[PDB]
Design an enzyme around this catalytic site. Structure first.
Site, PDB file in Angstrom:
ATOM      1  N   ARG A  49       0.861  -1.182   0.000  1.00 32.40           N
ATOM      2  CA  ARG A  49       0.000   0.000   0.000  1.00 32.40           C
ATOM      3  C   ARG A  49       0.893   1.225   0.000  1.00 32.40           C
ATOM      4  O   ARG A  49       1.630   1.456   0.959  1.00 32.40           O
ATOM      5  CB  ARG A  49      -0.936  -0.004   1.220  1.00 32.40           C
ATOM      6  CG  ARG A  49      -1.816   1.228   1.339  1.00 32.40           C
ATOM      7  CD  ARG A  49      -2.801   1.100   2.495  1.00 32.40           C
ATOM      8  NE  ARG A  49      -3.576   2.329   2.666  1.00 32.40           N
ATOM      9  CZ  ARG A  49      -3.468   3.149   3.706  1.00 32.40           C
ATOM     10  NH1 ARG A  49      -2.635   2.873   4.702  1.00 32.40           N
ATOM     11  NH2 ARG A  49      -4.208   4.247   3.760  1.00 32.40           N
ATOM     12  N   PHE A 102       2.061  10.805   0.801  1.00 28.81           N
ATOM     13  CA  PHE A 102       1.610  10.319   2.102  1.00 28.81           C
ATOM     14  C   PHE A 102       2.634   9.361   2.717  1.00 28.81           C
ATOM     15  O   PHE A 102       3.403   9.755   3.596  1.00 28.81           O
ATOM     16  CB  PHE A 102       0.191   9.728   1.994  1.00 28.81           C
ATOM     17  CG  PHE A 102      -0.376   9.179   3.287  1.00 28.81           C
ATOM     18  CD1 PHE A 102       0.074   9.616   4.540  1.00 28.81           C
ATOM     19  CD2 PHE A 102      -1.402   8.242   3.242  1.00 28.81           C
ATOM     20  CE1 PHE A 102      -0.465   9.099   5.714  1.00 28.81           C
ATOM     21  CE2 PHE A 102      -1.951   7.731   4.410  1.00 28.81           C
ATOM     22  CZ  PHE A 102      -1.486   8.166   5.649  1.00 28.81           C
ATOM     23  N   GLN A 144       3.676   1.695   2.826  1.00 25.35           N
ATOM     24  CA  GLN A 144       3.354   0.710   3.863  1.00 25.35           C
ATOM     25  C   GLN A 144       3.752  -0.699   3.451  1.00 25.35           C
ATOM     26  O   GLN A 144       3.548  -1.123   2.304  1.00 25.35           O
ATOM     27  CB  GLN A 144       1.860   0.749   4.188  1.00 25.35           C
ATOM     28  CG  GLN A 144       1.426  -0.197   5.280  1.00 25.35           C
ATOM     29  CD  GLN A 144      -0.027  -0.017   5.669  1.00 25.35           C
ATOM     30  OE1 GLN A 144      -0.619   1.029   5.412  1.00 25.35           O
ATOM     31  NE2 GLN A 144      -0.606  -1.027   6.311  1.00 25.35           N
ATOM     32  N   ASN A 174      -1.490   0.060  12.036  1.00 22.86           N
ATOM     33  CA  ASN A 174      -2.335  -0.642  12.986  1.00 22.86           C
ATOM     34  C   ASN A 174      -3.784  -0.624  12.523  1.00 22.86           C
ATOM     35  O   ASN A 174      -4.108  -0.064  11.465  1.00 22.86           O
ATOM     36  CB  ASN A 174      -2.161  -0.068  14.410  1.00 22.86           C
ATOM     37  CG  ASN A 174      -2.660   1.367  14.542  1.00 22.86           C
ATOM     38  OD1 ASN A 174      -3.743   1.703  14.058  1.00 22.86           O
ATOM     39  ND2 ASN A 174      -1.874   2.219  15.210  1.00 22.86           N
ATOM     40  N   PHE A 218       5.014   1.780   8.217  1.00 25.84           N
ATOM     41  CA  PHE A 218       5.062   2.681   7.090  1.00 25.84           C
ATOM     42  C   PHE A 218       6.194   3.681   7.245  1.00 25.84           C
ATOM     43  O   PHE A 218       6.645   4.000   8.358  1.00 25.84           O
ATOM     44  CB  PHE A 218       3.708   3.365   6.832  1.00 25.84           C
ATOM     45  CG  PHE A 218       3.177   4.189   7.993  1.00 25.84           C
ATOM     46  CD1 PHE A 218       2.556   3.579   9.078  1.00 25.84           C
ATOM     47  CD2 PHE A 218       3.266   5.583   7.986  1.00 25.84           C
ATOM     48  CE1 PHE A 218       2.056   4.339  10.136  1.00 25.84           C
ATOM     49  CE2 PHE A 218       2.759   6.350   9.039  1.00 25.84           C
ATOM     50  CZ  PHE A 218       2.151   5.720  10.115  1.00 25.84           C
ATOM     51  N   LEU A 226      -1.593  11.572  12.576  1.00 29.28           N
ATOM     52  CA  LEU A 226      -1.317  10.233  13.089  1.00 29.28           C
ATOM     53  C   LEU A 226      -0.657  10.256  14.466  1.00 29.28           C
ATOM     54  O   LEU A 226      -0.538   9.204  15.108  1.00 29.28           O
ATOM     55  CB  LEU A 226      -0.480   9.438  12.084  1.00 29.28           C
ATOM     56  CG  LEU A 226      -1.125   9.276  10.703  1.00 29.28           C
ATOM     57  CD1 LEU A 226      -0.198   8.527   9.765  1.00 29.28           C
ATOM     58  CD2 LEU A 226      -2.491   8.597  10.783  1.00 29.28           C
ATOM     59  N   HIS A 233      -0.479   6.297  16.029  1.00 29.12           N
ATOM     60  CA  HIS A 233       0.521   5.342  15.556  1.00 29.12           C
ATOM     61  C   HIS A 233       1.817   5.580  16.297  1.00 29.12           C
ATOM     62  O   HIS A 233       2.230   6.726  16.492  1.00 29.12           O
ATOM     63  CB  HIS A 233       0.732   5.484  14.050  1.00 29.12           C
ATOM     64  CG  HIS A 233      -0.492   5.141  13.273  1.00 29.12           C
ATOM     65  ND1 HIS A 233      -0.671   3.920  12.664  1.00 29.12           N
ATOM     66  CD2 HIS A 233      -1.642   5.830  13.087  1.00 29.12           C
ATOM     67  CE1 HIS A 233      -1.869   3.884  12.105  1.00 29.12           C
ATOM     68  NE2 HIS A 233      -2.476   5.032  12.346  1.00 29.12           N
TER      69      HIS A 233
HETATM   70  N1  LIG Z   1      -1.104  14.480   0.921  1.00 27.36           N
HETATM   71  S1  LIG Z   1      -2.308  14.377   1.992  1.00 27.36           S
HETATM   72  O1  LIG Z   1      -3.395  15.318   1.602  1.00 27.36           O
HETATM   73  O2  LIG Z   1      -1.790  14.700   3.352  1.00 27.36           O
HETATM   74  C1  LIG Z   1      -2.970  12.777   1.990  1.00 27.36           C
HETATM   75  C2  LIG Z   1      -3.009  12.018   3.158  1.00 27.36           C
HETATM   76  C3  LIG Z   1      -3.565  10.740   3.119  1.00 27.36           C
HETATM   77  C4  LIG Z   1      -4.068  10.229   1.918  1.00 27.36           C
HETATM   78  C5  LIG Z   1      -4.699   8.837   1.869  1.00 27.36           C
HETATM   79  O3  LIG Z   1      -4.910   8.249   2.948  1.00 27.36           O
HETATM   80  O4  LIG Z   1      -5.066   8.398   0.761  1.00 27.36           O
HETATM   81  C6  LIG Z   1      -4.027  10.997   0.760  1.00 27.36           C
HETATM   82  C7  LIG Z   1      -3.480  12.272   0.799  1.00 27.36           C
END
Ligand SMILES: NS(=O)(=O)c1ccc(C(=O)O)cc1
Ligand SMILES: NS(=O)(=O)c1ccc(C(=O)O)cc1
Length: 164
Positions: A54, A59, A62, A101, A112, A121, A125
Site C-alpha cells: 500500500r 503520504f 506501507q 495498525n 510505514f 497520526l 501510531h
Molecule cells: N497528501 S495528503 O493530503 O496529506 C494525503 C493524506 C492521506 C491520503 C490517503 O490516505 O489516501 C491521501 C493524501
C-alpha cells in the site's frame, strides 16, 4: 547505541537500492526490538521476501504484511499483536518510520515510512525510527503508488537485516 537496520528493495525485480533505518530503542525498546528481529528473521519469520502493498504518493509507503500481503496480516515477535508502547515520537516529516495498525493496541508487523509530515497520526501510531540513508529509494517506492494505495510495480523487500 540504537540499532541500524536495512531493507533492500526491488520493483518488478529491478533493484532500487537500500533503505537504512535507525530504530529508537531508547524511546520505544519493545517496538524497536520487534522490528529489528523481523529484519534479521532470527525468530524464523520476518520481512524478507514480503512487499510494500500500500503506497500513496504524498503520504506514505506501507509494508510488513508477511502473512497475507494485503494489509490484514502480519504478527509480532511477542504474539499476534502488541500494545502501543508510547506516542512520544511524532510524525515530524518525510522519513519517519511508524507502526501501521487497526486501531489502539493492534501493532503486529506492518509499518510505514512517511513521505510528508503526517501530524494527524500523532497519538494514534507509534513512531519508532527514521530513515538514515536511502530516501531516494523511498521516493522511488512512493512514485510506484497511487491514490488508492495500489502499487503499479511489485515492490519486494528482497533482503533485510541488522547493520549494528
Ligand atoms: N497528501 S495528503 O493530503 O496529506 C494525503 C493524506 C492521506 C491520503 C490517503 O490516505 O489516501 C491521501 C493524501
Ligand atoms: N521496467 S520496470 O522493471 O518495471 C522498472 C523501471 C524503472 C525502475 C526505476 O526507476 O528504478 C524500476 C523498475
Amino acid at each position: 547505541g540504537n540499532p541500524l537496520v536495512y531493507l533492500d528493495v526491488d520493483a518488478n525485480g529491478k533493484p532500487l537500492g537500500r533503505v537504512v533505518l535507525e530504530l529508537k530503542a531508547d524511546v520505544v525498546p519493545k517496538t524497536a526490538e520487534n522490528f529489528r528481529a523481523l529484519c534479521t528473521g532470527e525468530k524464523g519469520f520476518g520481512y524478507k521476501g514480503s512487499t510494500f502493498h500500500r503506497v500513496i504518493p504524498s503520504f506514505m509507503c506501507q509494508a510488513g504484511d508477511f502473512t497475507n500481503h494485503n494489509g490484514t496480516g502480519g504478527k509480532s515477535i511477542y504474539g499476534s499483536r502488541f500494545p502501543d508502547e508510547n506516542f512520544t515520537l511524532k510524525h515530524v516529516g518525510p522519513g519517519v518510520l511508524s507502526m501501521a495498525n487497526a486501531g489502539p493496541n493492534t501493532n503486529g508487523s506492518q509499518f510505514f515510512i512517511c513521505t510528508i509530515k503526517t501530524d494527524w497520526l500523532d497519538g494514534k501510531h507509534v513512531v519508532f525510527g527514521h530513515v538514515i540513508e536511502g530516501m531516494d529509494v523511498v521516493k522511488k517506492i512512493e512514485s510506484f503508488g497511487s491514490k488508492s494505495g495500489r502499487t503499479s510495480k511489485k515492490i519486494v523487500i528482497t533482503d533485510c537485516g541488522q547493520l549494528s
